[PDB]
Symmetry: D2
Subunit: 387 residues, 4 copies
């Protein structure tokens, strides 16, 4: 009973994940910098399908066009040598001091123009390398104090930025879509579009909404105490789950980025159940950081457990839904009725139906147990292999 990934499982990793040197707000790096081409090689040996990058992960900030082309050629050779893909790319609009008040919603106009130019340059590279999804994480968009940011004005600037990006892509004829990644706080005191629902709502006000979806992250919704599978279900319902970031988080605190399966393990089970049963077909991307306690052996051990835990949870969720006793429990709890229209007979028929009100026996209905606890222990037994 082993759980070996192959490139057909669509597992991806950011360069910055296994590449995290372990600098935290209170401590220096505990690991040396990794060459991108070493990370590509090591991830291919563990069974990954591809990698993702920020511009500045791949090409050092301030690189000349000569150095740029060098970095890209070495990278491209490692992808050719391994068969690794690049399904997603993104921009670093958070590290450089110039971004201290944001990129697209910086109060200084010149900064906002610079943010857009830096982004557009990396969309061209992403397209060259074959990415299908371009992620936007506005980690510097927000405030520590109420007077620093008019949020209506800041949403105007955010909408303006994404519309220009949408204009750019369509004018170039690129086949790339955008995915906005919410986060509620950190590094800003509050971040704009802090959850999946705020990002989905914002998208509906862009000039071309069909170009934009969400990239939700496990630990980011959990930093607001929200149910991550529920938010994914709403993203799926809206047709906007373009990409996903998988990791673990222990409750409401700083962003831990633990390997996938750590943190809330039952949430991880229900997440995998939903992605698999909804037939999500995008990358299974890990946005995680190996703890700074670890050396490079612990780095690759952590990246491998990401994939392992996904595959174990996939097996247990599938055994759960395939169990006849579970299918019977689901009927007992009326999940079949949840899927039926309330009033396909229409409004007037509803209004005329005395069994819906005048003659509805509310005490008999109230008395029916939902049988959720038996259902939930079957799920528990399946997760633990006690079934």
């Amino acid at each position: 009973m082993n759980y070996q990934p192959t490139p057909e499982d669509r597992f991806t990793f950011g360069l910055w994940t296994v590449g995290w040197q372990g600098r935290d707000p209170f401590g220096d790096a505990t690991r040396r910098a990794l060459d991108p081409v070493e990370s590509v090689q090591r991830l291919a040996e563990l069974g990954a399908h591809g990698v993702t990058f920020h511009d500045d992960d791949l090409i050092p900030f301030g690189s000349s066009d000569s150095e740029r082309e060098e970095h890209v050629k070495r990278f491209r050779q490692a992808l050719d040598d391994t068969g690794m893909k690049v399904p997603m790319a993104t921009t670093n609009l958070f590290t450089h001091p110039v971004f201290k008040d944001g990129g697209f919603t910086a109060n200084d106009r010149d900064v906002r123009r610079y943010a857009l130019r830096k982004t557009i340059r990396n969309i061209d590279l992403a397209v060259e390398l074959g990415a299908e999804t371009y992620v936007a994480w506005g980690g510097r968009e927000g405030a520590e104090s109420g007077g620093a940011k008019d949020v209506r004005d800041a949403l105007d600037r955010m909408k303006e930025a994404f519309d220009l990006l949408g204009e750019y892509v369509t004018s170039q004829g690129y086949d790339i879509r955008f995915a906005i990644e919410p986060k509620p706080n950190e590094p800003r005191g509050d971040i704009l579009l802090p959850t999946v629902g705020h990002a989905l709502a914002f998208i509906e006000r862009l000039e071309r909404p069909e170009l934009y979806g969400v990239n939700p992250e496990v630990g980011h919704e959990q930093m607001a105490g929200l149910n991550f599978p529920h938010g994914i279900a709403q993203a799926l319902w809206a047709g906007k789950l373009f990409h996903i970031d998988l990791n673990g988080q222990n409750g409401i605190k700083y962003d831990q980025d633990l390997r996938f399966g750590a943190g809330d393990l039952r949430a991880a089970f229900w997440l995998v159940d939903l992605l698999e049963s909804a037939g999500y077909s995008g990358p299974r991307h890990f946005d995680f950081k190996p703890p700074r306690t670890e050396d490079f052996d612990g780095v690759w051990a952590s990246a491998a457990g990401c994939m392992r835990n996904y595959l174990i949870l996939k097996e247990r969720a599938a055994a759960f839904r395939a169990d006849p006793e579970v299918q019977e429990a689901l009927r007992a709890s009326r999940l079949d009725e949840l899927a039926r229209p309330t009033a396909a007979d229409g409004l007037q028929a509803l209004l005329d139906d005395r069994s819906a009100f005048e003659e509805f026996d509310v005490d008999a209905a109230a008395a029916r147990g939902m049988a959720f606890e038996r259902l939930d222990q079957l799920a528990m037994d399946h997760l633990l292999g006690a079934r």
Copy 2:
């Protein structure tokens, strides 16, 4: 220096607020039930503009049509006697045991039909009494366990319910709009549409989106650790702030419903600054519970402090925005630049502008301080009257 409300301040209260008997999960009622007509009279004397109700606050669950008409006539006489209005009404789809798995997203279809019939009956009454806004708080819509609720199916049923309600209103020719009230948890382990952003996103998938907005509550967004003024700004930006619930909350815990001004007092300041500067013109509604430590004198003291605190914060926010030294600080922090388009010159001009990238001096831009801390201490001095 006093702070006396008048009906022109548009302060409203639910019957269930000053009427809360003080039953909590661990204790019996500490106060006797109030007659609605007593509450109408006492709130009119304190300077309120109107009251709101759930169906079951006004007419006891299971009332005959004869008793119903009696309750309504007494109520209507008290409104005539006081000049109090009824700007908003809502449905109780949470107290009765029949609603233990929800109203509109109950797994049992018969329950969902009953929920819609109970709602429609109260929309007719609300219209009769002159309400302009109908609130929907789906406090029983959600789950304690992952297998109990398919959330895609449950959003389908939620959409179906709100579309039928929209069909009903338009067929009757009623001038009433709907406001969805988010809450993240309690009494369900997780509640569907848990924040303002999730409710805004959902609305965009209804058949007639222009009929629906949000009713955000201070303490409910704060139960997810979110910035309430930021979520209101996004609701204002979308044109969907139909109504608002004002109260106080101390952080991430059970729903406290403290009087307005308690809880996060700086958030309350920034909220009032925003409602007043955006020119919000709906009711200022208090959804609060006087602590069960209190007798009826403490009830009316608490309701009065709601209004007082709003008026004190209104004065301090206005003095803040009117202060020349503040207007100068706002320019120092480039709030004026935040309000200017990033690229009114358009995409091609942006692309051709060397000052936006090739010749942008990122170190000079990085070095400019934002001066937010001086701005925030001016706001502090204004709030405390130390200015």
Copy 3:
């Protein structure tokens, strides 16, 4: 592979747990009241070892001495008929309106005297029924506002109450110890002694500290975002784990009281690992509420899953510690070194040791990986039975 409890597993339940009628802050009871003697019989059939009670669970508030003796005789017959024990008892100082500002720290002195008299009466009964532990949960001790409670004065009154209780027990010659149960909030805005550490610290100021320990509850420490196994380890380290309350909680929100194993499942694993490896020998008590969605079949299903989940986690934790590959990983991560004295050679030798400072190679030490991620995935594989 089944997991059947016997009375030798020391599983206990409060009468109020399976007896919870499902009244919540927003809804009426969904279940009828259970007779205590029915609950005793049903729990004995599921394999429990005993039950616990508040005074008012067993004897209705205001009962005459004639009714009191009746209730107790019926109860005692059910225990004789089933072989069920009563290892713990406690007082209801939270439900009655008289306790709205607390019992032992109520501002009204007369109330505080009444609280002590009500407590002492139930200690005599507890002793009669054989309880070894008397729990104190001061759920009404605290405040919603800062001026309502001087906390120094309130700790003085709390200390006074517990000292008098300690005087009472020793004067009667009773073999009973006290266990204080912390909770951070709910139903009060803040509760005094809000965590395990605050309760442990308080105990050290009582006149007879050896009479008092803690009764920690899973969901209560998790309501402050704390690591429950870490707090139990500190209680074990102090010698003060007199009793424990087992249940589940999903993060920082209202007190859910889900069955044990729900909530944070990895915390539950590490908790069972610690109780079993430290050789805790008190009751395994479930303080949980079957969700109000359930009928009586779902009640007994939920109580049974409490016990099942404990036994599954016991097996997986034992397999984890017994695995040679785990024992090797533990050495790799230097858990053996953590258990050795830092400086058994004493202070002067430490000071004279050049290898501890002058000649300590800090870069070689820094470079050693901790290998925690491989250890943690072995724990994961063991929990999931993927091992």
Copy 4:
């Protein structure tokens, strides 16, 4: 109406506070390094009374004894030139990679010995510079995973470390006491002794408890959602408030370290009320970070607002307690009764008192309102200067 600090207000600042360069988990430094002697001069001009330091703030890690003595002489000249004091010192056991698994509870024994030697060297310097308090913040003591740290063994090592430090001080005849600073998480997934109560409890197991107290930090207790004034009251009650760290925090998230008065402003009011009315006479120390949005002008503006906000809150708290109408409200709410013994008449008299039970009228007692809401609005009016 201004609020000018003098050195008699006992305001202190860490070198690392105004010296924070603005490196966060996601971004580079936004400010250049400050010379300690510049910070001493600038803080003296703003009215501070003294500064505090980590060893590595003052003397660069790895400094030769020649460089060490140089750094110290320059520092000492700036203190002589300004009249600034050094009331507290501490050790950096968190930045260097060698401390990635802790200092005193590192799994590697050699590291733990090195941590103690590094500490002892800085106690000698602290004594030389006149510090009265030595702070210990074990920010690296804890774990991201359950198998990485046996917490009983780790408390044994923590106790061993503090006992050796206590032995050292007493053998040298130094007049210095220790203050343990709790934090619940960050940078470790969970930190040992995570709150004030856990630190107080631990102290009671040291060989010489009278040498040790707590250094609580505003934002650290609030990261667990705890009431900071309540935890200070318990520290005061135990006689263990040796030192305090003042700052602001917006709820349960990463450690913000905002200037004092930001964050929870009503908690700040109640904190100042308590320190002033209990007559706390230690330093008023600011452990804060000027946001990385700021230049050096915004640094000194932020440090100045720390002090200003303390002085404004001091004035409002004093006006609150001095108001006759408040003193009357306090009696109305029976705060005077809270301060009286419950049973100075003793146990036997309590037992014989029929007015405490047999003849206690529980309904009359229940019916008395606490009048807390009127009290709390008077506090509100005083804080806002609306009084």
